[model samples]
Target: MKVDWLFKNVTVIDGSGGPQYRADVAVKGDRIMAIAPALDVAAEQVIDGQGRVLAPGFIDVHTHDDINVIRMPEYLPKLSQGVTTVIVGNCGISAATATMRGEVPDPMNLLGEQQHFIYPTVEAYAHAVEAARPSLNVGTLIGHTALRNNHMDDLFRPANETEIAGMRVQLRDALRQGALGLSTGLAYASAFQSTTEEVMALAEELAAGKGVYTTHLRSEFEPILEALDEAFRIGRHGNVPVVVSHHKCAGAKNWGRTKETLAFFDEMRQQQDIACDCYPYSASSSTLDMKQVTDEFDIVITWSEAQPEQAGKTLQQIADEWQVSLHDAAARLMPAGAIYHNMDEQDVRRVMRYPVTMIGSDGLPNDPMPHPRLWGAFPRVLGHYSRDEQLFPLTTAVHKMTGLSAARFQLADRGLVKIGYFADLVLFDPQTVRDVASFSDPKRPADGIEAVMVNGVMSYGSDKKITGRAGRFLRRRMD
Candidate 1:
């Protein structure tokens, strides 16, 4: 038999949360054709896997790459880490279907500036992604905040009935055009004021579209249980699966609360379809909110439109330099990005070990000093946690990022090394795979991601250069 590519002598971690096995895999065109021991076959290109690990390419289930997929399509930061697909428009801020008025809202700016938000509909955004020909596949979720920005005149107040109707129309249209689902950043001020009834009304549109509901939750601090209740209620209202985005027990007061949250999730899962995504790091990043300013934990400023000079300084450092209160200094740095070193490592591990938790970078692509998760989330899970600390086996780690993520996101024919699945795969030295990017220096790629292929096309090679771009705009799977 002749195949497009044949990978021989590889240890296959089939992304099934099972044990690894040695096998030879064959790819033809955009799908896997065969998998077995060595056979008499011909191939256009053959790779000597050298007993290295071959697994499904990772799926970054939560990302802010809504605009970067079009602005900079090479996407080396994620591709180099063996990520072949990224689900964008997380935290209630999507570039598509947003018609910005003047200045971009608090966290919406995390996607890009006003001019970059030209796609007023999901169809338009999907067209742009196709035109960009990004290195990896892209999927999107409709942002509740972006919809509100389009209809509501004032973001600080709840939307009226008329506004709600308008938002629904846009959401339905996006879902019809193949958006994954709806997401909300209710914790942010821009969305904080939105009543639960307001979100429930929008969620009503999800059922017929076969879309899911993901949220940043109304709170991750002391009121987290209440927030979880709200998310489950919204999911029940919509008759759709719910995914809690970047689930964490943030703030010093809320540390070690994952035990409570995970129990809550287990309880909710028994009643309804519920899951969550989380990053490997203990810190969280986003636009700096004055409400979140605290001296209890270190808060590093990633970017500040108001005071560009304070990008790398901590909020406390800036406050001390200005001889002002933390609140006052934070107030001066309006419209800025921050990295909050808030979570305890124990809590992060507890959440990561959960059976339902999927891995997501929650990476901020536009920040000047982005979180290292942008480049290192997947590898860190594979290396630091799985290899070094032994928090979980390597196969389990792969399942979290690939198989579990694909199933939760409903990415059909992906996340597994089955013969009929798409030929999106990665080959790496599992013993050496590790994340090199750090909070101090955040843009470096990972180590030991030897080769990556997307749709049967080798995109990233062992030399760390992108060889091809075969990524397509993934649409919602309608069954």
Candidate 2:
């Protein structure tokens, strides 16, 4: 056998929550071929471990990289952070469903920001990606708001039986076309328009195929617990796994709900029913226009227009220049732009440390100023919180971003370093890597991570390089 690559003397965390041990590993193309103390192996390349932790690369469960991945295929911050795969169609906002009936939430909606764009359906977004194959592996979950917008515009209204059926059929088609599952921005207009019965109807559709139901639930504010309860009920009825995507208590009025909210998860987990993901930051950014929202927390910060320069400034700052209330300043920024900030920093660490917690960037791809979550999430978890912050054990934290996420999402053949498994991997320095980017500096890349790989190929590496574009567009496979 032509063993293509080999590594020597490294402690491995393999992503299975197993104890790390010293091992010499070998890779044959994309599959792991050997794992032993010493392997007399020959390969095209050799990487001296010098005692590093070798593990599966992190997979971001929720992100808005659909557009950015195409434009910025280099994706340095993510690669430098050891992130391999990023699940993009989260919170019912993505380009894929732009071809459907309703206008896709172009930026952020989950945190209650308004988004407006011309692309009306998933097919349209899919077409766009097809036109521009990206560098990173991508998976999609059709957003519910796109479905609702095409069908219903009256936010907070009930879906008729006919509309429900139509949505079911649309979801079935999406699933058939390789959608991993479904996504919903329940806190916003289109999805908010639908009733519990309506949501349950969509959940039922996903359950049939053992698909996932990823949601930006009805509220992250005071009503957050109630919103979770609603999802639990739907999951119970649907018999499918529910992922509470991008969970954070937004706005100053809504901050500090982390401990209590996670307690709620623990309660439900005791019943064994639901799961959720979070970005490892105190602030969240989304695409919402200022006119519809009046919260100062909804003040403008550049996010998900997908470019690099526009990120990191606040609406309050813009308001200062423009001389308006943060809200009014945001409205002037864009009729439907992205802005979200309502979370307790204490809550972020508390939730991230939980076993059920996993990392998700909730990043939008195009904006003058983008959310720091995209570039900083994985390294933030691995570098800042886990290593620098000492908030959680390294192995446990790695699992949240690696194997735990794969198991939850049912992504086959990835997320672990087992024999015969695809070698999606990450290499990083335990120390020195941390998130320098903040709400004030969203474009800064993280520190510490040294390399990222997908399917046994080097997507990005420490020498400031990428081997090749080794990513694949992944679809749902119940089989």
Candidate 3:
């Protein structure tokens, strides 16, 4: 056997939520060559696992890293936390399968400036990612908002049949090129105008590709249940699995609704395929919205094109300083970004404990004052939620971020520690692994991640250095 590298005597989590066992893991080329109780192999390199945990590298199933993976391919935020793959184009804002004549729309601008959106087809984006050769693997979901932006002259109204037909052609093209599925951010104003029927019409294309459907529900507030129902109906209409992105009850008034929400998903799962992904935080961040502006919770302005000096100030502070109402101040800071501190910690823990819930960072890599979830989510799930709070076993945390995510996304032969699987793995000291990044210092890397291997190549080290750029654009497996 050609053993390229070997790890001996490591505690294996295996990403299966199974009992831990000690084993020697071997790698050859881009695949795991062997795993056994012991392997005395003559290899080019060897490492004593030193009682650390070896598991499948984390897969971020929800992200807005569509362009970041191509532009800033080192991807320190994800690499430092042991993430080897990221699912991009969540929340209806993909850079691919799009061609825009005007400025990028509100949430789509969350990805990058108009100059960054040059890919007119999904295949173009894939080719670009291949050329960039980022540090982590990437799978993409075609954004519904991207389609709407491409076909509709105005984003404020329902698309006509002609427009819908154009979108259908583009969507089918991307799916043919192996896009995972369709993702909708119906919550954003840019897409909120799209009626349920409009989305259902697009979802029909997904059924033909056997692709999944993911959505940021139209309302995460009091009417969230209705939004969930609408998502379910659309998935059922198309005969596809549904993923509720960043599943949460936003706004202070909507707190404590997670129990009811999980129950609803439980019942729905009995009848159809339904799952959700959530970042491990009680706060959410996105482009500032008029409807979301309020005095009930702390909303911090992360950036503002209208008033650059106002960035990093709270809405109340900005209002007080400007000698105006909060709404007035928010209006003045048009085209802005914010961090809304609106969720309940108890609710966050409850939803995370549910077996159906997978861990997705939902990170906005482009935001200057980006949410800490970008750097902290996976580590917090491992150390804070699992090790500290005992919300679930460490193995369960690994499963949610790795095995469960890969299975749900249906990425063939990845996200497991089995022999012959792609050698995308992480080595971490369970005793010291924890997230150091916080809202105050959102860009800091994590601690205790010894090394991250992608495609059988050592890419990141505990010394805080990137050694390899071995990642590639992953085409969806149409099963």
Candidate 4:
């Protein structure tokens, strides 16, 4: 039988965390039609995949690309790095179901400005994404903070009983419209005032919808263990699986704490379903928080609404230029973006090596000087960590980014090289594949990603050019 495309003589990692094998895979329509050694098949396109690795396309389980999927549908930043699907609305800031009041809140602004907040429901957001026809599949979660902004008049206090009911209405509406679950960013000032009861109340709508709970913990510093307990408690109350977003131990005092954190995760896993996503980077990026300002590590300013000229300079450098203290300089750059180099390399490795860890970029798209993770996270894991430093086998690395991510998010018919699965695949030369983007030059595409296919359509070709767009706004899998 004829097929649409055929890949010959390639190493198939299959995204299963198993050993690799030599196989020829066939694609027809939008599914994997066949896989075997030296299949004799006719096709419109035959890619000679010798000396390259063909695996399930990378899934970015954590991202803030809620608006970019519509505003910038080409999305070369992710596509160029072999990412065929991205899970947006991470860290409690979704463009869906948001009705902004006056000024956009601190971390919520990381998604977009007030004008970009047009989608009042998940249905509206999904409709817009369908119209855009992005290059990759998009899945979203309803943000708890977005719902609070719609119902609460003051964000600096816990929601009242009436307000909690109001937020629950919006969240249930979003879940009905196909949102994956609820995400919370309790660490940000907008949600920091909210008590555990407030979040547990909101999470009550999740279990019936088969939704999951993902959180940017209340604290990642000294009180991280307490924060983990809070997250697990919320998950237990909701009766849903828990995903700790971009798991990290931040601040100088919090260095080398993954030893404790991962151990805690292991102990908790025996009782309930728990997993976490992490970027392969030491630094963390977000809106500049006054509470996070310190001299313990380098804090580079990426964007500033109050002082636009300070972009790309370290906060300390800006302070030296202004003849003021670090706190004062940070205050001047309010409503800005920053990258904090506050993690220990050892801790990053320890968490990444954890069996339950999945890979996510956590990349902020709208920042003027976005972190290198935007363009580099997946490749860095494959090239720098797996190929060079020997963090884990290449197959394990692929599983962290692909199979494990898909399983946790409940993305059906995707993220694997199995018969009848969606044809989301990437081919790359493992020897030369690596991230070219850095903090200084943060937008460059990766090297050695030969081709990217989404839904049996070649969106990015061997020549590193966009050939087609066949993306869909994926709904949550109920089964």
Candidate 4 residue lDDT tens string, 116-202 = 999998889998998998999999988888888899998999899999998988888888878888899998899999999999987
Off by over 4 Å in 1: 286-293, 300-338
Clashing pairs in 3: none
User: Per-residue error at 121 for model 3, in Å?
Assistant: 1.6
How do the predictions measure up, each by TM-score? 0.93, 0.85, 0.94, 0.94
Q: Write the per-residue lDDT of candidate 1 for residues 159-203, one digit (tens) a residue.
A: 899999989988988988889999999999999999999999888
Q: Report per-prediction Cα RMSD to one decimal.
A: 2.5, 4.6, 2.3, 2.4
Worst window of 10 by summed lDDT in candidate 3: 203-212
**Tens-place lDDT digits, model 2, residues 150-226:** 56544457888887888888877777667777888887765676788888888887776557888888987778999
Report the Cα lDDT for candidate 1: 0.91
Candidate lDDT scores, in order, read: 0.91, 0.71, 0.90, 0.91
lDDT of 4 at 53: 97
Per-residue lDDT value at 365 in model 3 = 83
Write the candidate numbers in order of decreasing lDDT: 1, 4, 3, 2
lDDT of 1 at 324: 100
lDDT of candidate model 4 versus the reference: 0.91
